[PDB]
Nucleic acid binder design. Structure first.
Ligand SMILES: Nc1ccn([C@H]2C[C@H](O)[C@@H](COP(=O)(O)OP(=O)(O)OP(=O)(O)O)O2)c(=O)n1
Ligand SMILES: [Ca+2]
Ligand SMILES: [Ca+2]
Ligand SMILES: [Ca+2]
Length: 341
DNA sequence: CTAACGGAATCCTTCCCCC
DNA sequence: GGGGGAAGGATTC
C-alpha cells in the first residue's frame, strides 16, 4: 500500500495562534485547569517556543510556570480546536475516499489508487500541506510509507512542519536499527519488559520463541510486533466511529459522602448527554478516580435505550456499588456512555 | 476556597458464566 | 475448548 499520514503541528497551541496572531513567536502554553486550587492542572500542549525549555504535555501548570513565568497560559478551548479540526478533516477527504481519522489531529489516507510511486505521493503531501496552509493556515506534517505504522513513524521523524517518505528499503533497515520504544503502541510498561527479554530492535522479536514473548506482553502485542518485523503488516484504512462519550470532573475535595458526590456526578451526566447529540446509548458506566489516581468503574447495560432520568437514578446505584467495594476516597467522578444504536 | 498533578478516548487482558 | 460480557490496564492524544 501507500499510506499518507497527517499530523497537525502543536494543534491546540497553533489554533490559538491563528485566532490571535500576536501570540506568534511567543511561548504559548495551553493548560487544563482542574479547579481545586489555582494553577492546579496539567499542560495539554505547548508551542515549540515553550517546548524548547521542557514545557510539554503532561507536566503540571505550577511546574511549567517555574520554567517560563512570562509565558502565555491560555485555557483549553477544546470545542474551538474541534471545529478547526473538523474543517481540516473535510479537506483531506478530497484526496482519498478511504480515510481513517485517528484523533483530533491525526488522519490516515489510503492513496494507493491516487498515485503511482512514492515520488508522486510526496508531491501529493506537498499539495495537501499547501492546501491546509492556504484555507486554514495550519502547518502539518506528512508521513508516507507502505502501512499505517511506518507512515506515523515517518511523520514522527520530520515532525516540525515537514514531510518524510520511508521507502521499502529504509523500512528494512528500520526493522534492524529503529529503537523499539519509538514504535507506535509501545509505552514505558511494555518497552521495559522488552528490554528484560533483550529486545531493543524489531528484528529481535524474530529470534525469541513466540510463547516467551506472548507471556510477557500478550498475544496481540506479540503478533503485532512480529508482523512488523517480518515486513508483513498491512492493516487497511478504516472509518472509525465513536464508541463512547464521557465526562469526568474533579471535585473540590476528596470525599466519600454520597450527597456531596451527587452534584458532580449529575453535572457529568448533563454534560455527557449534551455531548451525545442524538445516538441513544444502551450502557452507562460510573467512573471514579481514587485518592491515588487509580481508576474504578462499575457499569450497567440495558436491553433498551437509556433516558436522562434513567441515567440519573441508575448512576446512583452504580456509584454506591463503588463505595461498597472500595475504601479509597474519590478524587474525580464521571460517567461514560457506550453501546449506541 | 486555593492543597504535589487534566480530560478523553481506544483496544487488550483477565476472570467467569455458558454452549 | 471456545464465545461473549464486566472490570482493570496500557497506550496515546
Ligand atoms: N498528553 C496530551 C497530549 C496531547 N494532547 C492534545 C494536545 C495536542 O494539540 C493534541 C495532539 O498532541 P500531539 O501528541 O500530536 O502533540 P502536538 O500536536 O501538541 O505537537 P507535536 O505534534 O509537535 O508533538 O492532543 C493532550 O491533550 N494531552
Ligand atoms: Ca499526533
Ligand atoms: Ca500533532
Ligand atoms: Ca514511545
Amino acid at each position: 500500500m501507500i499510506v499518507l499520514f497527517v499530523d497537525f503541528d502543536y494543534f491546540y497551541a497553533q489554533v490559538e495562534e491563528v485566532l490571535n496572531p500576536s501570540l506568534k513567536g511567543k511561548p504559548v502554553v495551553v493548560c487544563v485547569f482542574s479547579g481545586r486550587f489555582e494553577d492546579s492542572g496539567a499542560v495539554a500542549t505547548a508551542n515549540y517556543e515553550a517546548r524548547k525549555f521542557g514545557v510539554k504535555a503532561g507536566i503540571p501548570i505550577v511546574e511549567a510556570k517555574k520554567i517560563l513565568p512570562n509565558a502565555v497560559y491560555l485555557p483549553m478551548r477544546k470545542e474551538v480546536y474541534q471545529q478547526v479540526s473538523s474543517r481540516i478533516m473535510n479537506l483531506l477527504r478530497e484526496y482519498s475516499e478511504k480515510i481513517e481519522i485517528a484523533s483530533i489531529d491525526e488522519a490516515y489516507l489510503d492513496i494507493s489508487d491516487k498515485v503511482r510511486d512514492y515520488r508522486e505521493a510526496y508531491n501529493l503531501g506537498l499539495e495537501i500541506k499547501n492546501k491546509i496552509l492556504e484555507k486554514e493556515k495550519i502547518t502539518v506534517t506528512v508521513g508516507i510509507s507502505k502501512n499505517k505504522v511506518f507512515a506515523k513513524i515517518a511523520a514522527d521523524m520530520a515532525k516540525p512542519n515537514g514531510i518524510k517518505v520511508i521507502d521499502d528499503e529504509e523500512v528494512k533497515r528500520l526493522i534492524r536499527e529503529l529503537d523499539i520504544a519509538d514504535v507506535p503502541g509501545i509505552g514505558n510498561i511494555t518497552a521495559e519488559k522488552l528490554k528484560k527479554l533483550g529486545i531493543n530492535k524489531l528484528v529481535d522479536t524474530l529470534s525469541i520463541e513466540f510463547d516467551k514473548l506472548k507471556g510477557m506482553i500478550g498475544e496481540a502485542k506479540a503478533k503485532y510486533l512480529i508482523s512488523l518485523a517480518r515486513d508483513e503488516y498491512n492493516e487497511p484504512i478504516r472509518t472509525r466511529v465513536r464508541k463512547s462519550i464521557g465526562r469526568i470532573v474533579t471535585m473540590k475535595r476528596n470525599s466519600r459522602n454520597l450527597e456531596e458526590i451527587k452534584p458532580y456526578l449529575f453535572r457529568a451526566i448533563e454534560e455527557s448527554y449534551y455531548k451525545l447529540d442524538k445516538r441513544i446509548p444502551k450502557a452507562i458506566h460510573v467512573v471514579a478516580v481514587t485518592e491515588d489516581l487509580d481508576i474504578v468503574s462499575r457499569g450497567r447495560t440495558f436491553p433498551h435505550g437509556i433516558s436522562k432520568e434513567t441515567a440519573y437514578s441508575e448512576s446512583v446505584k452504580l456509584l454506591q456499588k463503588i463505595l461498597e467495594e472500595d475504601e479509597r476516597k474519590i478524587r474525580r467522578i464521571g460517567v461514560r456512555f457506550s453501546k449506541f444504536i
